[PDB]
Design a protein around this nucleic acid. Structure first.
Length: 57
DNA sequence: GCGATAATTGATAGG
DNA sequence: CCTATCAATTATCGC
């Protein structure tokens, strides 16, 4: 069984955004910032750094 | 530091 | 596949 945090959860109707080491955040709508592309090719899925208004760090 | 305006970056539309 | 237009993000100016 996949017993981990996964930082995904079931949330969408809230302040959902992507946050990387740069501290920059993406709303998830429209188009992603230049760092999203970099983080994606960095070897990690964008979902791996998906933080919402809830369960936020 | 927060708010608005301008430039760059990403996706969608047209050829 | 390449060029143009619209939408979001990042940076600069104003408060």
């Amino acid at each position: 069984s996949h017993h981990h945090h996964h930082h995904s959860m079931g949330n969408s109707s809230k302040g959902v955004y992507y946050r990387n080491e740069e501290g920059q955040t993406w709303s998830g709508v429209g188009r992603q910032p230049r760092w999203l592309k970099e983080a994606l090719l960095n070897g990690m899925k964008k979902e791996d750094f998906l933080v919402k208004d809830t369960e936020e760090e």
